[PDB]
Amino acid sequence: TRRGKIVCTLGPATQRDDLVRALVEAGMDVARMNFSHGDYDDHKVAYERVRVASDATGRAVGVLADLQGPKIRLGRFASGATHWAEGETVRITVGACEGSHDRVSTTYKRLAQDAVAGDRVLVDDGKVALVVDAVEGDDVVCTVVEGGPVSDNKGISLPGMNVTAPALSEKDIEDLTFALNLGVDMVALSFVRSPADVELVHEVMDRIGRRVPVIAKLEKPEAIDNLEAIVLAFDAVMVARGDLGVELPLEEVPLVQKRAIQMARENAKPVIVATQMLDSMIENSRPTRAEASDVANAVLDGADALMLSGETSVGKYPLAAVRTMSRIICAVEENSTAAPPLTHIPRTKRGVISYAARDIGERLDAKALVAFTQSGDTVRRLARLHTPLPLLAFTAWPEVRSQLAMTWGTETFIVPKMQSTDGMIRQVDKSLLELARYKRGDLVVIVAGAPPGTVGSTNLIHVHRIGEDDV
Amino acid sequence: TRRGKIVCTLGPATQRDDLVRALVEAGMDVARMNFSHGDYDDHKVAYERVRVASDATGRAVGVLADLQGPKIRLGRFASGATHWAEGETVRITVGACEGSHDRVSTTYKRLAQDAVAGDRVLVDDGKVALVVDAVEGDDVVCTVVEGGPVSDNKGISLPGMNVTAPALSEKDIEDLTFALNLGVDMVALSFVRSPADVELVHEVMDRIGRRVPVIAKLEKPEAIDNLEAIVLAFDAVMVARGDLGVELPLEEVPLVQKRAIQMARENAKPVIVATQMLDSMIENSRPTRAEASDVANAVLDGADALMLSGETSVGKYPLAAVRTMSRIICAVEENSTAAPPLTHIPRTKRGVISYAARDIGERLDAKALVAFTQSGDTVRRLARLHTPLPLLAFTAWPEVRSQLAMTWGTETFIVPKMQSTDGMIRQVDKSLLELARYKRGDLVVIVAGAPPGTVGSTNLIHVHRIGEDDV
Amino acid sequence: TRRGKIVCTLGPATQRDDLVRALVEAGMDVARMNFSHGDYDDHKVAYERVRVASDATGRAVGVLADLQGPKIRLGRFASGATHWAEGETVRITVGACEGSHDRVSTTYKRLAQDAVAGDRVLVDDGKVALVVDAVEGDDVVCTVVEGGPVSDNKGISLPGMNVTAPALSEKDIEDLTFALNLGVDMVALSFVRSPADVELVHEVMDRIGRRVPVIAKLEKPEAIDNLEAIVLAFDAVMVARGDLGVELPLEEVPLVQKRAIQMARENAKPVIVATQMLDSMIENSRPTRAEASDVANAVLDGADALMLSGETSVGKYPLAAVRTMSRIICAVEENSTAAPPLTHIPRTKRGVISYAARDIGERLDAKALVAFTQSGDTVRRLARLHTPLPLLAFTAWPEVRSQLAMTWGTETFIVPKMQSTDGMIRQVDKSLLELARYKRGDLVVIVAGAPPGTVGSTNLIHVHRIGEDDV
Amino acid sequence: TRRGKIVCTLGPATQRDDLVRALVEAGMDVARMNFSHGDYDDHKVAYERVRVASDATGRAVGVLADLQGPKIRLGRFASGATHWAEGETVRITVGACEGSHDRVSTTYKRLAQDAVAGDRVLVDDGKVALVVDAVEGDDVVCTVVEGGPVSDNKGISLPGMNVTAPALSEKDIEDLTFALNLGVDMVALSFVRSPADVELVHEVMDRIGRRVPVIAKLEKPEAIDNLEAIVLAFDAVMVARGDLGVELPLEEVPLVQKRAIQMARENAKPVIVATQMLDSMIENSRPTRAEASDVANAVLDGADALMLSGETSVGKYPLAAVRTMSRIICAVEENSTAAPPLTHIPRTKRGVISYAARDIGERLDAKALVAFTQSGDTVRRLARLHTPLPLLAFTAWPEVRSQLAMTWGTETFIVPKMQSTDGMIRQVDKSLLELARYKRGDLVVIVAGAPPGTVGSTNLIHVHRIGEDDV
Ligand SMILES: O=P(O)(O)OC[C@H]1O[C@H](O)[C@H](O)[C@@H](O)[C@@H]1O
Ligand SMILES: O=P(O)(O)OC[C@H]1O[C@H](O)[C@H](O)[C@@H](O)[C@@H]1O
Ligand SMILES: O=P(O)(O)OC[C@H]1O[C@H](O)[C@H](O)[C@@H](O)[C@@H]1O
Ligand SMILES: O=P(O)(O)OC[C@H]1O[C@H](O)[C@H](O)[C@@H](O)[C@@H]1O
Ligand SMILES: O=C([O-])C(=O)[O-]
Ligand SMILES: O=C([O-])C(=O)[O-]
Ligand SMILES: O=C([O-])C(=O)[O-]
Ligand SMILES: O=C([O-])C(=O)[O-]
Ligand SMILES: [Mg+2]
Ligand SMILES: [Mg+2]
Ligand SMILES: [Mg+2]
Ligand SMILES: [Mg+2]
């Protein structure tokens, strides 16, 4: 079975009866609640359905709060959706209006102040493209240079305009709050520009007194210019290709992705690859040949996780999207799970020991690798190496099981806290023995530390056969 | 400028006035005439427009005749197109009929004889799926299991159904004939299953007395089971992913592609990657992020050429499709033109010498590599190595220039036959100096052979400064 | 300090007061008692002197019993020594007689039976050479082809001709017995030809009820034809270059040595390089430039140990020979202790774990590597890798400390039997702390096993700071 | 045949009739005339005998003038020799006197000016050692700390103290002159310290109007501190281990040798390894096991040439020494001629092309590699790579044939000045065909350049079959 993790975005297509369950049953490892859309009641109900289904199935499922960030949007159209055709003129305004095909509203209120003639406006990541002709008072007059349908509150991107808006708005702060108290496992911040942007998120966490993993969404050129520092300051990164493809040249993204996945793995942080991986599959029962290739290539690049956005949130074949994504990942991994090697020899205690542990296990044809961890960090330095062996994490903190649902090839087991390393070995033996694929005499390699209960204290590898007294 | 070659399929969207010109000006290296559709007048006019534009611009543009092969398809619907929706029952028949939504005709006349209940029927390379319920006489009664639009005469695929039809039908033979006498540079055979299938093509060529390079289209499991032998028996291969993705599990294709590109490069044969690379761009002015990834990955896999099918033949932005494909290729190549290395050290005189020539040029920071070739084989063994240096082919046979338009990173120059290697050197200097981007004193490495005008006789490398007396 | 081990042969030059002491104080790691010369009281007293000085200094010193083997020699001359000069006729006979210049006897009693005209006889490991002319009944009539003095009972070599003789003679059996009861740590067998020859040695040990490590001396073509099998059947090997250089062409020896060192290291068996390493130091206070090179090259080849024969047994500067040998070894090792890598990845539990432990220690800037062993196998699989870190063996069996004095770069510490991982680790802390050299808080890697007190139980690595609570 | 070159030193043992002949017939590639000993008539007659035997046999034999340098010495003793035994006092003085047991003179006239107490004095490259006690006026008062005999004019070494003495002495200048006019091919300078020391030598050559190759003898710590610069300023280097082993710690030499050979190979300059390689053979018909190892190791280190000093100049088996050295070299080379790879990719035109030529030849199983060279630079960049293919140099300047007799694995052929590429290739065919072992159809790779007759013209490779039309 599968090593690569699957992240699904929830929405209207996942609201019908026990559909969230079906996704979890079909392979969903992380559930993304997008806070760009929806109402607090909708999120809460979604989050409950995940917890029920996770707990009802036995399958770890993390819950990811995606914060809108400084996203610029359109208002509502009187029609709710119109068609903007090439050759037509449209006025985007800062001013409150009844929204229509010829004049529509936007959230960025500095638009007229900051937009100059020539500037480009991309809608829905390139579905329509406009160029600014002039600024007539509080409107921006643009001529449509690529025609298509636009709908209420759709995202617009103004490449090259210095956009001034806070890392976290009040909507963002108030959604962070609601999501932290709801119990989510992780949080993603949109439109990250600096390594210090996490500090603001952290602050709110400290006010509320509850911190979680913060994922950086890489969708700005500034992000890519400070990639290493962002990967060290944040806990994870998402290659957010949609906005990244209109903020950068869309032809540059394939290489940015590859360079960003490598960077995460180097520093042992999870990486998600997102947006239009199976875009075709919103309307079609099978994907394109390019889409299948895009997924297989995200695997061979070394992605911890791949994500589906519209394909599950509003799509018509949300199960087939998750199912197919898994078949492809599995198809690639059957051939080889080997990933692009690291460019350095590990230097941290935990990194070095997890490296050695991988060596021993693979060379002895061990049945599984087992790692004990408080923060998940030990387990992530082994995950990044992409072993074909089952990697099994053992931890006392249940939240870590949900946090490790987006870390590559890792299955977690929650256990009572131990105060002796032999205790730990017995625990492993107990848990493993209840599993179909495990038996007595079977060989496993266990990574551990002492004194137990201490993060980073990992310092021990043990080659153990299930049930024997080799301790 | 670009090294990766772009192959476009011509059709109705290229028959608007001076459109073929625009494509060649925009980057088309090979023009694919698909013999599935169109009539001889349509093809002939297209082929002329390519020769005019090639000759008018100076840009080499090869002409590829794609033979339909044993393709199975539907008839014409009375309304021209219908929608087959999930749940509906449809009868495909051997019998001639008036065609409709409830009963349509097919070309494979053994369908009722060879199709059993359970078997699946995919339409349009996967977009509509049926399963066979029963055989009533000369009908096949199916239930539509995935619903969508079907149009007149569309292709159907009966996976893992032993289909008996000749490698080349009479239509195919008569299209080979028409295309050989029209002057085309290469020929592609569809649905290749054996290495001996080229023999049949060759035979007809010998009857008609004009041989060209034969490309194998890899879209059958048999093809992939005999991949090495097919790549040695044919002159080129195309990874024909549409049919390949319904004849094999669509998740297996990404790896077959990569394995097939490696195999072509090993044996120094051109390889084309085809079908849905930028599928989205038929209707949209920009592609998806998966499509862009699919193209970048075909480059990094090592493809000589990438192809557009519907994106130029019936699409709405055929110019933008070609332009975009080139921007991506170029984006990847600016970073690095490195391909996955060969798995062997060359053994053949031509291979070894072209390898050494690459070495010398790169190590001396040469301005260009120059190779002389009768058949193009010397030039292809250097192309496969993917050098960042300009590779420039010199040949006396003009058809080779068009044959090398689908070989990676190669530019050709036609020259008069010389009878001394001395005279070859001066020829190179003459031609190169008429370029804007060359100067006297520039350093160049020249591969050649003596006695001249003999195939495979390549046996000399010369390190030469433009204009100077080092000969 | 030094990592490469030094083996000295004891003899007349080491019998003056506290000279054995001086050698041990000057670096002798193994003492070789050669049973070809000297008598049991000479050996006994030498053995007493080694154990006194070993015990008095704290330096481990192994004791090696070298058995003469099937050595062929001459009988005794009336004058005790004659001079054979070129051109003369000499008759070596199977008959009984007390020698003279013209006719002398030999111990190989099949000389006349097995020698043909054309064969060669070399005396004193080469410097006096005869060629066989005829066999007249009992005598072998030869011509002296390179003249010089022959003495009583001098060793003669019948290169190329097949000698039939038992692996162990009765003298060898009786010296095995005397040396086993005297309490020697290892035994070397001379002129080994087969992997089955250790069986014979083993048998006698089983009769006598005491087994020790058996070293194979490689000085026969048959030995090198069965090199791998001999290295797997024996516990160690010695490249015995003296006889090897007359039994094989002396020009073949350099490469056999290198190939034999590689073979030992691969299968984790100690290897000694012997004979004339510093030959000129018998007369001279300094060696030649070739001798110095030969020693440095035995180091770089990967030898566990280098040996001195005449340089200490009968030489004039026995102390200086040992001191010089150590300066050179040390000079090479300061530069780099890197040895030619293994041609395989370790496959055995103990091999795999000791490799990983080396990795971790070196990556984490550890102060020492510590390994627990019953027989020494675990410790030798790490020694063979040649680490620059201190390798420290911990064992309850004191004889193993003397056995590991010929294994590369290993210092051994004897401890009481421990019944706990805890116990083991605390013992390490105690021992290491009691050196000036170690401090509390220092970082070390410990290899061990459980259940304790079992050979090959090895299954754990522990990263431990001296004195801390991390167990 | 052999690829490694053998250099022999001539002297008293080579002054018999047809003794010089015997060496050339046995394998001598370079003849070394040592200008420390003997007089101009002795040298002349030696030089005549080399040129006769070279010319009479067809074997290239270079002639090397070794200049004494600023060698420091003792004066003459009244009795011609005395014996200094440990415990004695001796006074070495900068005063004039005829020596005796207790007070002898030296040639370095600054001994008293800059000897300090504590300094050491080795006599006869180490066998007699003294320690400096004081300076009384102009005598240097020492204690004999290792006893032995000293004779007239014996060399003394002042390790550690800075000697000020000119790069070339006046004896050296007038021996340079005598040797240049005698017609020697190369010159070696002793006790080189600086890259500017060759300027001195060059200057004198320019006065006298004849330059030859100048070899640096590496026997000083200053030399090794400036090793790279000396190898770039000089044309060759000799690792002069005798004096190097008393001027540096004798244990440091084996690694300096290896480091110096690598440095020569990298910059494509010949390197000789000298002194005591088979020292034992002066008195013995066979060498030691260490000596044989030292020779094999000089081969595997990558030496162009190995040298014999006393073994041929004053030894009793000069012929056997040369023969033995060759058997061992040959034994190593039969196995593998592989040398430690360069630490850089060639970037000079002639380096790069000679590299490629090696590639082509080996990949095509060519019979030989053929290189045209004016000075030998091109030929030496291929020699340094150690190919198993025959390397054959073609040159018009006959002196270069003798200069290339110390370059690895190279055989030279003298040809006329040509002005034609065709000419050159036919010349190769002519010359090669006169060897039995080359025939028509045989494949050879030829390196050359145009315009002919220019050093560094090199710019072409040609793959040619003997006698065929591939020109
Ligand atoms: O080299 P490693 O041990 O694998 O650690 C890689 C790097 O990224 C980690 O995630 C840590 O934040 C860094 O301190 C570390 O240098
Ligand atoms: O790798 P090389 O030695 O250059 O040759 C490449 C290989 O494929 C080519 O296309 C030839 O058909 C083969 O005979 C050849 O072995
Ligand atoms: O696999 P390793 O740990 O490197 O051990 C290599 C070899 O060592 C010893 O000689 C064992 O007897 C062998 O069975 C083993 O194959
Ligand atoms: O690049 P290569 O031909 O190997 O040369 C590398 C170096 O060695 C040569 O001997 C030259 O003295 C240097 O100028 C040169 O840079
Ligand atoms: O906001 C998004 O959907 C993204 O860019 O991933
Ligand atoms: O025939 C086709 O169009 C194909 O296979 O891609
Ligand atoms: O006895 C030995 O060791 C030898 O022959 O070298
Ligand atoms: O004279 C020499 O060459 C030396 O000192 O080695
Ligand atoms: Mg976004
Ligand atoms: Mg097809
Ligand atoms: Mg022996
Ligand atoms: Mg010297």
mmCIF file of C-alpha atoms in Angstrom, chain D residues 171-298:
data_model
loop_
_atom_site.group_PDB
_atom_site.id
_atom_site.type_symbol
_atom_site.label_atom_id
_atom_site.label_comp_id
_atom_site.label_asym_id
_atom_site.label_seq_id
_atom_site.Cartn_x
_atom_site.Cartn_y
_atom_site.Cartn_z
ATOM 1 C CA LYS D 171 81.783 23.201 -10.551
ATOM 2 C CA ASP D 172 78.228 22.729 -11.649
ATOM 3 C CA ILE D 173 78.381 25.575 -14.200
ATOM 4 C CA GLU D 174 81.412 24.085 -15.902
ATOM 5 C CA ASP D 175 79.923 20.639 -15.886
ATOM 6 C CA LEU D 176 76.761 21.992 -17.353
ATOM 7 C CA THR D 177 78.976 23.420 -20.064
ATOM 8 C CA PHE D 178 80.903 20.187 -20.604
ATOM 9 C CA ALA D 179 77.679 18.118 -20.697
ATOM 10 C CA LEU D 180 75.843 20.541 -23.036
ATOM 11 C CA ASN D 181 78.735 20.405 -25.542
ATOM 12 C CA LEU D 182 78.990 16.615 -25.131
ATOM 13 C CA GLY D 183 75.337 16.391 -26.424
ATOM 14 C CA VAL D 184 73.265 15.211 -23.425
ATOM 15 C CA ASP D 185 69.466 15.219 -23.692
ATOM 16 C CA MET D 186 68.481 16.330 -20.196
ATOM 17 C CA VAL D 187 70.016 17.834 -17.112
ATOM 18 C CA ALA D 188 69.177 17.295 -13.428
ATOM 19 C CA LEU D 189 69.869 19.929 -10.769
ATOM 20 C CA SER D 190 70.432 18.778 -7.187
ATOM 21 C CA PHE D 191 69.102 20.449 -4.003
ATOM 22 C CA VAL D 192 66.552 22.625 -5.729
ATOM 23 C CA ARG D 193 64.719 24.929 -3.369
ATOM 24 C CA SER D 194 62.960 27.488 -5.519
ATOM 25 C CA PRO D 195 61.135 27.790 -8.822
ATOM 26 C CA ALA D 196 63.649 30.521 -9.738
ATOM 27 C CA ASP D 197 66.551 28.025 -9.643
ATOM 28 C CA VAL D 198 65.872 26.958 -13.206
ATOM 29 C CA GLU D 199 66.413 30.549 -14.327
ATOM 30 C CA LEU D 200 70.015 30.181 -13.321
ATOM 31 C CA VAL D 201 70.309 26.988 -15.311
ATOM 32 C CA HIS D 202 68.490 28.496 -18.257
ATOM 33 C CA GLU D 203 70.739 31.562 -18.318
ATOM 34 C CA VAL D 204 73.896 29.434 -18.605
ATOM 35 C CA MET D 205 72.262 27.424 -21.364
ATOM 36 C CA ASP D 206 71.517 30.679 -23.172
ATOM 37 C CA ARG D 207 75.099 31.841 -22.802
ATOM 38 C CA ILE D 208 76.269 28.507 -24.186
ATOM 39 C CA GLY D 209 73.419 28.608 -26.697
ATOM 40 C CA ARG D 210 71.807 25.270 -26.052
ATOM 41 C CA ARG D 211 68.811 24.455 -23.831
ATOM 42 C CA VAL D 212 67.694 20.985 -22.853
ATOM 43 C CA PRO D 213 65.139 19.633 -20.400
ATOM 44 C CA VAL D 214 65.950 20.515 -16.824
ATOM 45 C CA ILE D 215 64.895 18.037 -14.107
ATOM 46 C CA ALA D 216 64.424 19.170 -10.534
ATOM 47 C CA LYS D 217 65.710 16.908 -7.806
ATOM 48 C CA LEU D 218 63.359 17.047 -4.855
ATOM 49 C CA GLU D 219 65.521 16.551 -1.795
ATOM 50 C CA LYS D 220 64.836 19.594 0.349
ATOM 51 C CA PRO D 221 61.988 20.663 2.533
ATOM 52 C CA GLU D 222 61.886 23.956 0.651
ATOM 53 C CA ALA D 223 61.341 21.993 -2.551
ATOM 54 C CA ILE D 224 58.318 20.262 -1.160
ATOM 55 C CA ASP D 225 56.940 23.499 0.293
ATOM 56 C CA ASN D 226 57.009 24.920 -3.304
ATOM 57 C CA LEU D 227 56.270 21.659 -5.094
ATOM 58 C CA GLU D 228 53.599 22.938 -7.476
ATOM 59 C CA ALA D 229 55.655 25.972 -8.548
ATOM 60 C CA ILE D 230 58.791 23.875 -9.044
ATOM 61 C CA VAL D 231 56.847 21.386 -11.225
ATOM 62 C CA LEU D 232 55.576 24.284 -13.356
ATOM 63 C CA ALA D 233 58.948 26.020 -13.649
ATOM 64 C CA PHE D 234 60.963 22.838 -14.278
ATOM 65 C CA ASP D 235 60.436 20.369 -17.100
ATOM 66 C CA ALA D 236 60.629 17.259 -14.958
ATOM 67 C CA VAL D 237 61.113 16.229 -11.337
ATOM 68 C CA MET D 238 63.026 13.484 -9.593
ATOM 69 C CA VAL D 239 61.977 12.317 -6.157
ATOM 70 C CA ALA D 240 65.547 12.137 -4.810
ATOM 71 C CA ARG D 241 64.803 10.045 -1.761
ATOM 72 C CA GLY D 242 68.358 9.617 -0.478
ATOM 73 C CA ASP D 243 68.951 13.208 0.584
ATOM 74 C CA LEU D 244 65.222 13.738 0.987
ATOM 75 C CA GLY D 245 65.232 11.033 3.647
ATOM 76 C CA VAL D 246 67.862 12.787 5.768
ATOM 77 C CA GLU D 247 66.718 16.368 5.080
ATOM 78 C CA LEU D 248 63.186 15.377 6.018
ATOM 79 C CA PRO D 249 62.188 12.700 8.460
ATOM 80 C CA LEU D 250 62.656 9.388 6.609
ATOM 81 C CA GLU D 251 59.092 8.489 7.529
ATOM 82 C CA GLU D 252 57.744 11.551 5.664
ATOM 83 C CA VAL D 253 59.143 10.525 2.296
ATOM 84 C CA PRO D 254 56.750 7.795 1.237
ATOM 85 C CA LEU D 255 53.866 10.287 1.223
ATOM 86 C CA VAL D 256 55.896 13.106 -0.298
ATOM 87 C CA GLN D 257 56.753 10.700 -3.154
ATOM 88 C CA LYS D 258 53.100 9.969 -3.748
ATOM 89 C CA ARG D 259 52.135 13.607 -3.549
ATOM 90 C CA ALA D 260 54.955 14.612 -5.896
ATOM 91 C CA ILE D 261 54.127 11.982 -8.491
ATOM 92 C CA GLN D 262 50.506 13.108 -8.539
ATOM 93 C CA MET D 263 51.642 16.715 -8.989
ATOM 94 C CA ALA D 264 53.817 15.845 -11.978
ATOM 95 C CA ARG D 265 51.133 13.836 -13.650
ATOM 96 C CA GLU D 266 48.603 16.624 -13.192
ATOM 97 C CA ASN D 267 50.855 19.152 -14.947
ATOM 98 C CA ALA D 268 52.086 16.503 -17.390
ATOM 99 C CA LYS D 269 55.732 16.489 -16.362
ATOM 100 C CA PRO D 270 57.825 13.384 -16.136
ATOM 101 C CA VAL D 271 58.666 12.084 -12.709
ATOM 102 C CA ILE D 272 61.500 9.793 -11.679
ATOM 103 C CA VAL D 273 61.539 7.854 -8.427
ATOM 104 C CA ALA D 274 65.087 7.340 -7.203
ATOM 105 C CA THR D 275 67.449 5.848 -4.724
ATOM 106 C CA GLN D 276 67.686 2.431 -3.000
ATOM 107 C CA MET D 277 64.743 0.927 -4.873
ATOM 108 C CA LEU D 278 66.698 -2.292 -5.088
ATOM 109 C CA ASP D 279 69.589 -1.374 -2.786
ATOM 110 C CA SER D 280 70.057 -4.977 -1.660
ATOM 111 C CA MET D 281 71.052 -5.975 -5.217
ATOM 112 C CA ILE D 282 74.542 -4.397 -4.874
ATOM 113 C CA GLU D 283 75.632 -7.528 -3.028
ATOM 114 C CA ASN D 284 72.817 -9.937 -3.808
ATOM 115 C CA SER D 285 71.501 -11.620 -6.936
ATOM 116 C CA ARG D 286 67.932 -11.146 -5.668
ATOM 117 C CA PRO D 287 66.250 -8.247 -3.868
ATOM 118 C CA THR D 288 64.346 -8.105 -0.594
ATOM 119 C CA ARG D 289 60.601 -8.408 -0.308
ATOM 120 C CA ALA D 290 60.491 -4.695 0.626
ATOM 121 C CA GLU D 291 62.492 -3.653 -2.346
ATOM 122 C CA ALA D 292 60.223 -5.582 -4.735
ATOM 123 C CA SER D 293 57.235 -3.913 -3.003
ATOM 124 C CA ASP D 294 58.828 -0.489 -3.311
ATOM 125 C CA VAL D 295 59.155 -0.842 -7.065
ATOM 126 C CA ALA D 296 55.626 -2.166 -7.587
ATOM 127 C CA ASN D 297 54.341 0.708 -5.469
ATOM 128 C CA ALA D 298 56.225 3.315 -7.494
#
